[PDB]
Structures are given as structure tokens and as C-alpha cells.
Design a protein around this nucleic acid. Structure first.
Lengths: 98, 136, 176
RNA sequence: UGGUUCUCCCCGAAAUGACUUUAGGGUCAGCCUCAGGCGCUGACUGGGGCCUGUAGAGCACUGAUAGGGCUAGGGGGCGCCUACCAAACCCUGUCAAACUCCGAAGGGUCCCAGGUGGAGCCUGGGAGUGAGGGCGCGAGCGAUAACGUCCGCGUCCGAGCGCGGGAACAACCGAGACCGCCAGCUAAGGCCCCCAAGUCUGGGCUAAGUGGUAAAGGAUGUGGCGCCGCGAAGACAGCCAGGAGGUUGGCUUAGAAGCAGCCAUCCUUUAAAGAGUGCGUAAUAGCUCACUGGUCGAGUGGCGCCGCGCCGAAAAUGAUCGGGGC
RNA sequence: UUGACUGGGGCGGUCGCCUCCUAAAAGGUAACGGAGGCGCCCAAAGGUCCCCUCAGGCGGGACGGAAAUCCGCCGGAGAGC
RNA sequence: UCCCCCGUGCCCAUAGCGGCGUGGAACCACCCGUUCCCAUUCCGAACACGGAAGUGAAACGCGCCAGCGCCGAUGGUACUGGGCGGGCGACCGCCUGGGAGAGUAGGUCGGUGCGGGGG
């Protein structure tokens, strides 16, 4: 089993919980200490193309505008099994860096 | 016959554990006063027990020494006693059932235990059964 | 058997105890009440009745409840009951211990050796309408050797043994 | 080490911690007193919020444990087999300062309140103390010895050897003495006399002078309650009479043929039923009911808790509960 | 000059620090009371990022104990530190 | 509104183990491949990328079951702040507040916010 929880090591509020399926990637901005979610940007549960990586971006841009819209910026990335690689949000806007 | 030992005297308060119930056997020997019973005593009783009815039934000794009884050599003061020397003992709080017999007549059984009591440094009482259990 | 069970109001358990009563309690998934009887009473009944046979209490107001004693407490110094919980029976299949009887005389006399009632009475799941008085033990062909346990009993109908099965229920051993 | 001189008033300790060639000495802290300053924050109490790991209790880990079961292995002839000799493992029972699945009362602290007290807090002047002791409760050491010894919480003595009680008596009971009174109420403990106040009024127990302070263990010592017999199937005590037949079955019989000792516990048969509890020797041979009629016509045998008492109980100058005497 | 403690002193033991217990559920707490350590060690045994999860028990496997190394289940911690 | 499912948090075993049928349209997974990114002390097993043919057998989701596990009263006691008697003592007992642990009855194969995709 993977006890990953690479997260849990999230203390500076605002979590960009991702989630790669086997076709669609979902990202989600969440507030801890007070369990609730705000910004969201799925893969095909949205629409756009059929190419993972390619999509993985236009799917992140999504969070950008969407988020910035309601006054969001500085945050920390996320997703544990994640393995910072292919899946990506390498995009402007959010000051989550990376 | 084990563990790290030469322990603290400690004391015997109320006999909140002085009062079980015949577990096996048929008749029994329950204690009335609290005390430390030297193994020397147990045997000295048990023996006379069996010995009272040569080639008889079964004897059950629920009490069991494990507490080390220390003692000084006949001098003054300087660290705990040589300890043990004489040996170990078991702690009996008024009510505990020490010995219990079975497989024999009450005339034989009852009279058997009576003797034991003389060996023990306490005051005893003899019991039958039919009492406690967990049935319905 | 039976015996008055006067409703316990709820005041000074000792007062009773000392006075003459004997605090108790009756209950099941439905009922739960404070009761009290009388030493001489309860004794005279239990001493022989115990908790193997059914007990029916006569509540001051008509009531006639079928019960059994699930547990009684003792005042260590000089065995004397302190409390009693009564199981108000009904119809649902219930658990309970039933007595056993060892008849005959298994080899063990030439040189001696006596048995050892390893489980006087056992619990077996059964429906109230049927509640065996005592069960039989056809053991008498075993010496200092082994012993019987579990499913070695002619457990009648509705007597699905409620144990392991494996509980050594008897054994014969050497003398002194 | 000893000594240290007039008077009154107010408050009043300490005998602990740390470090000390320190240990009957000393430095700082703690407790005392004085001056000034701050003013409800004091002790204690109520209601909330957490902290805790004891008493109990409990085996879930660490160990210990009696019995049975089951079972690697290991002795013994040796394949089968055989007593837990015996691993783990499952029950039944348990034990533990340095074990805990659990866990009180209680204790600690913060907040809000009550609380004007020889309460508090801040600064400064002066100290003494640093030799404690008893009692109660909780633990070590001891021997569940010591007016023993160490700690912990409290208290009293210390400094209240001032007052009442306890015969007397630092610390047990009562109670904190500015002073005066030939006034009253009460504490403790007392009310037969010494000796103030009932030979007070019911209801019971005890006959030892218990009371007037000793144990295991003993006895139909007394008084009050209980359960088992079982009594026209009318013995419970005198008492009559049989004192049954195969019983005289077992190693040892030299002798068990109860009246040697280890194996029995059947039968015949009725007065009834001794599979013999009893005086013996060589067994055996005899004795009494442990069974039954006649009268006799009634409470009798068997266990068990409770109150009081009795035996157990021997020391040294003359004895006694403080005395007398009950 | 030739120490102190010490149920008299001498002899004996001890003298600082760490950890359990005693210790009475906050701290703290004695005794020549019970029971063990320390007077060092790591240049990786330290940083950070990224991965992995033990010990046992049960089968199955050439040499192969009763754990050498493999494969398969079970095993929340009894290993490790 | 009420269903289904993919992410997530919270309560922290009454959601656990083990059984018993079900779900593939969606989702999810397993699958299809190893050219590229990047991979395993050797293995694309795991990480990873590219694809979607086939499957619900694994795994996960959802239900039912009590045999194991976990929970678990009420009563009643043990012990106990505080106060207090008896006895020479060892110890026993009452008053006033608190009050387990075991064991019984019994309960349980979850509960619940947030955001999404589908009828």
C-alpha cells in the first residue's frame, strides 16, 4: 500500500489536490482546518481534447482564471502519488510556484 | 523460579480478594484472616492432607508463594537483607480459598481439611459448594 | 420455582441487605427493573434451584415473569449474596448453562484415581419452550487416560452446543 | 562550654532545600518583625476548562503461576504405546514496587464569581532558625520487632510543663489563659462514698469479680434465633428377647473368617435386614446395640450462625480496679 | 599535611552525571532502600529531495541448521532506532 | 430535491477480519503497447509515457450476515475527599458526598461536511 501522504506535509494552507485517472486529470483547490473546497478544474469532466499532457495544462489554465477570479494566488502544490512529472500545471497565474 | 526479585514488603489491606469460590474440588478451605503463608506452611499442610487419606483423591492448592521474604543475618543496618534465606510466600487476604479436596466422602474430606487448618498460621472456615456459578 | 419479588423503589441498598431484603435487578432487551427479595427466600429456592432451572417471580401486582439468574454477587468475607440480575425470559432462543450427570463408574478403582468434573454444566443455545433439566454423561470406559469434551453429548433437539466445541468437560486422574 | 543585670505594650519563628575538608559551623533561599509604597489581587469556597496514572481492579504486553486439554521435541522396551517429566497453543484458576487493556476518589493550574483578612503584592532595615519530638494516615528499611529508622500529608508539643478530663503523666479528649467577681450556660468526661452532680426511668444480657484490657486451639458454660430428621410405620432414656442362614469372600491364612493389613461390598432371607462401629487372643469361640414387641405415652436426637462468659494464663521488695466497695 | 558520609568510630562501601522504582495519579520528595548505565561515538551515524516498511508464523524451494538467499499468504508493531 | 460515481476532509474500530450477490452506461481499475519523458541494486512488477481493442476475474464501490474483533449500559459492589465510633491489639463498622474495573442485558458489519461528473 502507499501511505504516501506526501501531503500532510501541507501547513501553509490552500491545497491544490490533483488526481490523475487513466484518461482524465482533476485538480482541486481546498481549504483545510475548515473542510471545504472552492476552485475546481477537471479534465474531460470539463471537455477539452483527448491528450493527457496536452490537456494537462489547458486544464490547469482552467484553475488559473477560475481561481484568480475569486482572489486566490499564493498556494502550495499537491497530490501524493503525484510523482512530480508528466502531469503538470506549469502555468502562469497561481503563485503556488513550480 | 524466575524474574528479577527481592521485593518490597508491602501490606495487606481489606481482603477485596479474600473470597473466591470452590473452583474444582468438592469441598474447601477458605481463609478468615489475612497473612503471609510460607511455602514451608503450604506443603506442611498439603502433605498432611494427602497423608490423612493415603491413596485417596485429588488435592488442589489454589494459593501459591512467589513473594520473596528477606531477612538479616543477626547484625545491624547496611542495605537490604541477604533476603530469602528461609524463602518465599503467598499473600492471603481473609476469604481466599487456599486448598480444596474432591473425589472423597464429606466425612473423609471435611475432616481432612480440618487438620490442614492447624498447619496454617491463620483461622479457617470450611465450605461445600452449589453456590456461585455462571449458569441459567 | 417462584417467589415474591417486591418492586425496589430505590433507596439504601444496605438498609435492605441489613433489614432482610436482597437487592436484585430484572432485565432483557425490553425490561430493566430494580427488585429485592429475602435471603431465606432466595436461598431456599436457589440453593437447590440455582441457575439451571426456571424461576418465576411474583410481583406484588399480578405479574408472573419467567426468569433465570444470570449472575449473583458475593461479599468475599463470608459468602453471602449481595445482588442478583434476573433474566426475564420470553420466547427468543436464549443461551444458558444446563447441568450434566456422570453416571456409572469409569475404570478407576483397582489402583484408584478419581474423575474431575471439568465443567459441571454447559451453555447451549436453546429456545425457552424447551429447557432440559440435566444432561447425561455416558462415560465409564476410560481410565487415567484421556477425557471427553465438546460434541460427545447426546445433545437433544434445539441443543446446538454453544461452546467451542472443544471444552474438556470431564477427566479422570490418579490419586495421592 | 559557661555567664549576659530595670519595667510594660504589640507581632511573633525555625529545627526545611542547595553548596560547603561540610556534618553540633557557615552562604543563599524558606518561615519572623519594622518602615514605606500598591489597593481586593489573600487563604478557603462555588461553577467551568484541560492536566495525572495512585487506590481499587485487570492480564491486552513483560514475567510469574496451580489443574486439565491439545501437542514440536525429549527419557523408557521400541512400533504401535505410556504419567502434562515437558515447548509453544486453548481453556479453568490466579500473582506483580521497577507489568497495564482500565481507572476512582483526590491533587495541580487557568478563567468567572464570592471572600476587608495581624489577607495579599512591591522595595528596603533588623532577625533568629538550619539539634526537633509525639500522634494519625500513606510507604520504605527492619523481624506486617522497638519510646527503632527514613521520607510524604496533617496536627499538636516545641514556644500552651497555663486551665478541665484521663489516678498520676510535653504532645490522647475538651479548649487558645488583658484583669477582677463568694454570677450564670456549656465542653470532654462524669453523677455509690473518698469526689461536684441520679444508688434516675424503661428493656435485656453476665455470675467470672468477668468487668479490672493475652493467642492458636478447646468445652452438653448460659441466653436468643435457624434447618434436617422424624414420633399410632406411637423408644428418646430404662428394659426383655433373638443375639439370623450362603456371611467364616481378599495377599497373609502360621491368622482376617468385623475384633491383623491391601483388595469386596453380592446373596439367603425377616424378628431385619451390620457390605459386622465395638472388649480379645490362635484363629475362631463368647459380651452390647449400631433392629425390631409389652407396659410406659411424650418432646427427643443431628448440624449452625449471634450476644456474654469459661479453660488455655508461671517471676522475683507488699498488695490493690486510682482506693473503698460493688 | 594526613577528607567527608557512617543507626559510635575503625575496617568495608561510597563521593559527579543518566534511567526505572520507592514517590502516596501536578511538580518536588529520604534511607549504608531495590536495579542498571556514562567519563564515549559518528566526516556519515549530519542537510535536504525522492523512494521502501518491520519481527515473526505458515507452507514451497540444489547445495541448504532450527532464520544464509527465492517465491507465496498471514502478521500493525511484538522489530529498528 | 432524491439516486450513482470520481476526488477530499472530519468522527478515529459500533467503520475491523471473515463470509454472502451484486455493479461496467458512466466513471475507476485492470487492461493495450515500450517510440518519446522517466523508470527499477534484475525486472515498465512499481514509478512513467503513449493508446484505447477486451474484462469486472483480480482491486475498489455498494448491499446482507454475527462466527472472530470492537463497543457496551443498569443494577451492585471495590476503593475513597470529609467526618466518626468499637477493641488491648491484628482488625471490624457507621454517617456524609464521589464511584470504578470486571461480568450480565444489549449494540455494531458505520456515521458526516465540501467540491465535482452522470439520470
Amino acid at each position: 500500500k502507499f501511505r504516501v501522504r506526501n501531503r500532510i506535509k501541507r501547513t501553509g494552507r490552500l491545497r491544490l489536490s490533483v488526481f490523475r485517472s487513466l484518461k482524465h486529470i482533476y485538480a482541486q483547490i481546498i481549504d483545510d482546518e475548515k473542510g471545504v473546497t472552492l476552485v475546481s478544474a477537471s479534465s474531460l469532466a470539463l471537455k477539452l481534447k483527448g491528450n493527457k499532457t496536452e490537456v494537462a495544462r489547458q486544464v490547469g489554465r482552467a484553475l488559473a482564471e477560475k481561481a484568480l477570479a475569486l482572489g486566490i494566488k499564493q498556494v502550495a502544490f499537491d497530490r501524493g502519488p503525484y510523482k512530480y512529472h508528466g502531469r503538470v500545471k506549469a502555468l502562469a497565474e497561481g503563485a503556488r510556484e513550480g | 523460579r524466575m524474574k528479577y526479585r527481592k521485593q518490597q514488603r508491602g501490606r495487606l489491606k481489606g481482603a477485596t480478594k479474600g473470597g473466591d469460590y470452590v473452583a474444582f474440588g468438592d469441598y474447601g478451605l477458605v481463609a478468615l484472616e489475612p497473612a503471609w503463608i510460607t511455602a514451608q506452611q503450604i506443603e506442611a499442610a498439603r502433605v498432611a492432607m494427602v497423608r490423612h487419606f493415603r491413596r485417596g483423591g485429588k488435592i488442589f492448592i489454589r494459593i501459591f508463594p512467589d513473594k520473596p521474604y528477606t531477612k538479616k543475618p543477626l547484625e545491624v543496618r547496611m542495605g537490604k537483607g541477604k533476603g530469602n534465606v528461609e524463602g518465599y510466600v503467598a499473600v492471603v487476604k481473609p476469604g481466599r480459598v487456599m486448598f480444596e479436596v474432591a473425589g472423597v466422602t464429606e466425612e473423609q474430606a471435611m475432616e481432612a481439611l480440618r487438620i490442614a487448618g492447624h498447619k496454617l498460621p491463620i483461622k479457617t472456615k470450611i465450605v461445600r459448594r452449589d453456590a456461585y456459578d455462571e449458569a441459567q | 420455582y417462584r417467589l415474591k419479588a417486591y418492586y425496589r423503589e430505590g433507596e439504601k441498598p444496605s438498609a435492605l441487605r441489613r433489614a432482610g431484603k436482597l437487592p436484585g435487578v430484572m432485565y432483557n432487551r425490553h425490561l430493566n427493573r430494580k427488585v429485592y427479595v429475602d435471603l431465606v427466600e432466595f436461598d431456599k429456592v436457589f440453593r437447590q434451584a440455582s441457575i439451571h432451572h426456571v424461576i418465576v417471580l411474583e410481583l406484588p401486582d399480578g405479574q408472573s415473569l419467567p426468569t433465570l439468574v444470570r449472575q449473583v454477587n458475593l461479599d468475599k468475607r463470608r459468602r453471602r449474596p449481595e445482588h442478583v440480575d434476573f433474566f426475564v425470559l420470553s420466547d427468543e432462543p436464549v443461551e444458558m448453562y444446563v447441568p450434566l450427570r456422570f453416571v456409572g463408574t469409569p475404570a478407576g478403582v483397582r489402583a484408584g484415581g478419581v474423575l474431575q468434573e471439568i465443567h459441571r454444566d454447559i451453555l447451549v443455545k436453546v429456545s425457552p419452550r424447551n429447557i432440559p433439566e440435566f444432561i447425561e454423561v455416558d462415560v465409564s470406559g476410560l481410565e487415567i487416560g484421556d477425557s471427553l469434551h465438546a460434541s460427545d453429548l447426546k445433545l437433544p433437539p434445539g441443543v446446538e452446543l454453544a461452546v467451542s466445541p472443544e471444552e474438556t468437560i470431564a477427566a479422570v486422574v490418579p490419586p495421592e
